[PDB]
Each structure stands twice: as C-alpha cells, then as structure tokens.
C-alpha cells in the first residue's frame, strides 16, 4: 500500500481508517462502552503542511462499536450524526507521504494516533 500505518491506543477510541487523499477521517470505539468525545480535537498533520484543527460540538458521544467518519468539503458526503459528519470548513484533509491523524480530547491530551508513512 506504500503507506505504513502505526496504531497506538491508551483509551477506548482507536483511529480505524485514514484516507490517503484526505477525503475522510475514520475512528473506531473498540471498547464495550460508549465514549463521550464532547469538544475533542482532531489535529491533522500532512508532513510539513500547517496543522488543520477540527473541533467537535460541545456535547458529542460515540456509542460503543459504532463508526463516525469525518468527511471533508471536497468529498461531497452528507452529515448524519452520530455516524456521519462533514467538515465543510476544510476542502480536504490534505495529502503527503507523512500523514498523521491525532485524536485530542477536551483536556488537550493525545489518546489515539495513526500515522501514514510513505517511503
């Protein structure tokens, strides 16, 4: 796939899938309990590109075993909570050989991260 994926998780939510073209960001709650992700921050790093910061609404909770996918403006997807959300303020999550998607909670702590590395 030419993009190595590094998965690390210390909480309940893991970064399930990252789009190489930056169309969407997919996270998974692999525990057996619902995770409240109110005002959690998603920071996307594309190599040396400036950070794109996405902020969730003040009250948001992902049910256990459910999938929420954050789509970009250029993707053309339709938001449908609690499973589908679209970030119209950003045309695309970006591209590059070093794509890093870090999930930041409301306390500014990194609990999940997945990095796409291409030789």
């Amino acid at each position: 796939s030419s993009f190595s994926q590094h998965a690390r998780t210390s909480g309940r939510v893991a970064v399930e899938e990252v789009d190489e073209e930056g169309k969407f960001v997919r996270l998974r709650n692999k525990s057996n309990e619902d995770q409240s992700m109110g005002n959690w921050q998603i920071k996307r790093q594309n190599g040396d590109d400036p950070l794109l910061t996405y902020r969730f609404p003040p009250k948001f909770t992902l049910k256990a075993g459910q999938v929420v996918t954050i789509w970009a403006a250029g993707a053309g997807a339709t938001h449908s909570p609690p499973t589908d959300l679209v970030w119209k303020a950003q045309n695309t999550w970006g591209c590059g050989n070093s794509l890093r998607t870090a999930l930041i909670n409301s306390t500014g702590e990194e609990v999940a991260m997945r990095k796409l590395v291409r030789s």
């Binding site: 049910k63 459910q66 449908s80 609690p82 499973t83």
Partner: protein
C-alpha cells in the same frame, strides 16, 4: 441505529405529517392506522402521551392496531420518544 426518515421526522416539528411519515411505518401499516382513525402522526403521538411513553404498551398497541412487528413498532416508538424529548 436510526433511519434517515426517522431523523427527518425528528429533526423538525411533526406539524401535520401523516401517520405514514412515522419511522418504520410503511403504506400498509399507515393505511391500517388511518382506518383505525390514526390518520396523522399527531394522533399517534397523542395516543403515546396517553400511553405515557411506555415502550411495551405502545408497541403492543401498534401491533394490535396495524399488525406492526417488533421492527416497525420499535422504530415508531423511538421516533415518537425522540420527538417528545426534542420538542415536548
């Protein structure tokens, strides 16, 4: 978990939507309920209020009033309960 028709009904005030607009309600069951007198979503919600939001009683009543299964009864009960939580 929820259908888009369910969300559309919930996302807006019920107004005067027909009983068929309720989640999990197709043509057959909606027509049956209209025959019973529940010709509109508001009548069903008023029944639900009289039922005082009991899931089992509401679903049993729906099955006895249009032959709805557990699927359709659950969908309608969820839609009405969410609409009540939002607007009532």
């Amino acid at each position: 978990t929820t259908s888009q028709k369910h969300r559309d009904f919930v996302a807006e005030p019920m107004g005067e939507k027909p009983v068929g607009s309720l989640a999990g309600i197709g043509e057959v069951l909606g027509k049956k309920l209209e025959e019973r007198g529940f010709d509109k979503a508001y009548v069903v919600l008023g029944q639900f209020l009289v039922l005082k939001k009991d899931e089992d009683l509401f679903r049993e009543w729906l099955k006895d009033t249009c032959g709805a299964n557990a699927k359709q009864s659950r969908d309608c009960f969820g839609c009405l309960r969410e609409w009540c939580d939002a607007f009532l």
